Amino acid sequence: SGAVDHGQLCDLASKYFGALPTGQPKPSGFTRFLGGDKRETNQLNPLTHVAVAF
């Protein structure tokens, strides 16, 4: 980003990063969402933080 040359970047990338393996694909699993609650009790804290997400 910025005052850069795309051709120079491509040449350097071929010089250095051209030998990386074509490894196995990114894992594609099922990440299940579990509704619920995680509550930490600290009555000495000056503020209470509550995040609710869907």
In angstroms, give the least distance from the CB of 37 to other proteins. Answer: 4
Q: How far apart (Å, rounded) are the C-alpha atoms in residues 39 and 50? A: 9
Closer residue to other proteins in complex, CB, 3/34: 34
Q: How far apart (Å, rounded) are the C-alpha atoms in residues 7 and 2? A: 14
Q: How far apart (Å, rounded) are the C-alpha atoms in residues 35 and 40? A: 17
In angstroms, give the least distance from the CB of 3 to other proteins. Answer: 50
Closer residue to other proteins in complex, CB, 5/37: 37
Closer residue to other proteins in complex, CB, 26/39: 39
